[PDB]
Structures are given as C-alpha cells and as structure tokens.
Amino acid sequence: VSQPRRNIVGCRIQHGWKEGNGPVTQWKGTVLDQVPVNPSLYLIKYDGFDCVYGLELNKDERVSALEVLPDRVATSRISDAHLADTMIGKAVEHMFETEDGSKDEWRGMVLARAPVMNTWFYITYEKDPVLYMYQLLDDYKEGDLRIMPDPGEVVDSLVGKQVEYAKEDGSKRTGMVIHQVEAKPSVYFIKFDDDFHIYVYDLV
C-alpha cells in the first residue's frame, strides 16, 4: 500500500472534454486499467455512460487539467459468483428499451468479469463491436437477459501486433491489439488510433 509515482488505476477522476474547439464540458469517471504495450493509455468508464473508452489521459491535448478525486470506488463484493461464472464467454440476448418503450434486443457476448467495479461486467455486441460495461446481474435478475447454450498450451495470443483494414474514404483503420480474453482466446481487444473506443474482435 504505497508507490513512488502515479498508479491511479482504480481511483476515480474528474476532467473536462473539449471537442475540436467547442465547449469544455466536465466529466468524471473511473480509471479501470492500463495497457502495458504502450503505457501512455488508460481505460475509463464514465458515470452515466455504460461504455468504456481508451484515452491517453496525459499525452493528449484534448483532455483538460487532470484532477484525481478522493472519492473511493467501493469494491462492494458481489453476493454470489456462481451465476457470474455461468455466463462468462457465452452468447446472450441483451434486451434494450427504446425511449418510446418499444422492445429491441441485441445478440452479444459476455466477455468476462470487469476490473475495479466487480458487479459490472464486460460485454461486446455483434452489429455494434465495442467494449461496454453493464451490471448484467440486474439484467438477468429482472428478466432482460437470456443465455443460448453451447491440450498443452501453444503460443496462442498475438497482443502487440499492429493491424490494418480497408474502408471507404480512402482510409484504413490503423491500430494494435492489446488483450487476449480469458474465456475465448480467439477474440482480442484492439485500439485504433484517431479513435477513442475499444473494439472487441474475433481474428480466427
């Protein structure tokens, strides 16, 4: 319980966001992790938005003066992990309610249990492929989530490999892989520069 400098992983922060040259709107969130391949990057979750982003909180002009709050993210350990373990790595239908109240479910996959906020859970979706955090316990409890069913280790993962793809406006997404998921080694977290969202992809 000490460290020479930084290590703000797991403690919430507050900073302002400036888009281009627009308004300085104030955001507060929780730092969840840091990536070792390039240690200038942190993962964040903002109170209000279930999504998780990846920002270079100290190497980025866009972020405002960085304030580290004394608020504590109460660990608040989960009652029972039996159900949590049943759904890590599976495929589930996530029920979503439109503002009008109409039904709309997305077929997605529960990647694994989240870090820092333990009740919250990682998830990616098929037609929308980015890293989200939802308290899926609440979901399954109220009935808005259902589960459809289904020797010596090799080199496996290729984290740290830069990748490239083909897009329309004479451009290609350029980023690198940053994580091998424990439940399914096929999928990986990939971060694309000029974008501040974490993508979860199956690279076969």
Partner 1 sequence: ARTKQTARK
Where along the sequence are the contacts to partner 1 (CB under 8 A)? 17, 27, 46, 48-51, 94-99, 104, 132, 134, 139, 142, 144
What's the min distance (Å) between Cβ of 51 and partner 1?
A: 5
- Is the CB of 66 or the CB of 158 nearer to partner 1? 66
Contact (Cβ atoms closer than 8 angstroms) between residue 121 and residue 133:
yes
Report the C-alpha gap between 204 and 196 in whole angstroms. 24
What's the min distance (Å) between Cβ of 149 and partner 1?
A: 24
Q: Which amino acid is at 89?
A: G
List the Cα angle 98/99/101 in 5-degree steps. Answer: 65
| CA terminus-to-terminus distance, the chain | 41
What's the min distance (Å) between Cβ of 170 and partner 1?
A: 27
- Is the CB of 63 or the CB of 95 nearer to partner 1? 95
- Is the CB of 17 or the CB of 157 nearer to partner 1? 17
- Is the CB of 46 or the CB of 201 nearer to partner 1? 46
Sheet containing 162-164: give its strands across.
162-164, 174-180, 187-192, 198-202
- Is the CB of 97 or the CB of 182 nearer to partner 1? 97
- Is the CB of 27 or the CB of 201 nearer to partner 1? 27
Contact (Cβ atoms closer than 8 angstroms) between residue 12 and residue 46:
no
What's the min distance (Å) between Cβ of 195 and partner 1?
A: 12
In 43-121, where does DSSP find H-type helix?
A: 82-86
Q: Max alpha carbon distance in the chain (Å)?
A: 55
What's the min distance (Å) between Cβ of 128 and partner 1?
A: 8
Report the C-alpha gap between 7 and 150 in whole angstroms. 40
What's the min distance (Å) between Cβ of 184 and partner 1?
A: 23
Report the C-alpha gap between 194 and 174 in whole angstroms. 9
